[PDB]
Write a protein that binds this ligand. Structure first.
Ligand SMILES: O=C(O)C1=C[C@@H](O)[C@@H](O)[C@H](O)C1
Ligand SMILES: [Cl-]
Length: 175
């Protein structure tokens, strides 16, 4: 079972944090969005467009359940997986790290490299805020470790997690 399952919104640093955490632990990194494409040979968008949302979610849940069973390292969950009741059920009992950010912080961090993100109009930021209002309550439900990542360097976030994922040395009996 995974050392840590990472959840959060775009802008939470989830990709970078996952890689860095896996590097520090020396464990494998499995991203469920990548795994779905590797197992189907179809892009995320293609699946949505042809089989529909519900079928994408069923495929994703199968992938997530298999990873929870078989993967020992860091598991990075796609951003909509927790909308599936079966995924929230399957997570119970796992170590689930929620990289928590505010709506304002998320909007800032998903603006990209343009200097004047406001000039493109409010629609993208409004859709982001809507997404956070829907997703954040579900991430708080499934979390076992909430980590405030607002204005923190990704290395500090990794240290915070590592200090709360320590494993004692085994006894003689265990060895
Ligand atoms: O927010 C979502 O529901 C999604 C997030 C991505 O990680 C992908 O799993 C896909 O684009 C759906
Ligand atoms: Cl690091």
């Amino acid at each position: 079972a995974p050392k840590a399952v990472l959840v959060g919104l775009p802008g939470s640093g989830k990709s970078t944090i996952g890689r860095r955490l896996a590097k520090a632990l020396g464990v494998g990194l499995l991203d469920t969005d990548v795994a779905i494409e590797q197992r189907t040979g179809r892009s995320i968008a293609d699946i949505f467009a042809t089989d529909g949302e519900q079928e994408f979610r069923r495929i994703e849940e199968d992938v997530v359940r298999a990873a929870l069973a078989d993967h020992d390292g860091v598991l990075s969950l796609g951003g909509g997986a927790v909308t599936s009741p079966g995924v929230r059920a399957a997570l119970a009992g796992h170590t689930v790290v929620y990289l928590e950010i505010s709506a304002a912080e998320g909007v800032r961090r998903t603006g990209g490299n343009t200097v004047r993100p406001l000039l493109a109009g409010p629609d993208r930021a409004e859709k982001y805020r809507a997404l956070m209002a829907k997703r954040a309550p579900l991430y708080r439900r499934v979390a076992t470790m909430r980590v405030d990542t607002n204005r923190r360097n990704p290395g500090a976030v990794v240290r915070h997690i590592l200090s709360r994922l320590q494993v004692p040395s085994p006894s003689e009996a265990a060895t």
